[PDB]
Write a protein that binds this DNA or RNA. Sequence first.
RNA 1: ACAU
DNA 2: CGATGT
Length: 136
Amino acid sequence: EEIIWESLSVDVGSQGNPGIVEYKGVDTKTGEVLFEREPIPIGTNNMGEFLAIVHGLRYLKERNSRKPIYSDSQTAIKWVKDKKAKSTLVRNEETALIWKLVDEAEEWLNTHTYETPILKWQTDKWGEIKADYGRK
RNA sequence: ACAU
DNA sequence: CGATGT
Ligand SMILES: [K+]
Ligand SMILES: [K+]
Ligand SMILES: [K+]
Ligand SMILES: [Mg+2]
Ligand SMILES: [Mg+2]
């Protein structure tokens, strides 16, 4: 504890896992939706969580914002730290789009710098992350 | 087991 | 119940 309210919170939403994947980022303090990705026909929860963080990094950098990012995903936080999304999802024609986006997100991480702290949202203490889709 |  | 991940 406690919550850094001056922050950006991100989350994935899906229909199936693997299944249709989307994500969004919100102002933690107000819940204002700041970005939303068009649904991607097949992906995994963790791919979406990863893309959401990287999109947040790009969004904040473009706006010269030093706010931290909250994610509830232990997995995605680690993938971003490593600059490598270690997904098990088969690479085939059906999954080409999500894998293109993941590949491109890794590529962005490997060609840009950032100081943005990427913080674990402590769901057990604070409840659902403010970017949550409310589907569970 | 923990995080989804 | 099923799945994705460390
Ligand atoms: K949800
Ligand atoms: K959660
Ligand atoms: K498991
Ligand atoms: Mg989440
Ligand atoms: Mg959620």
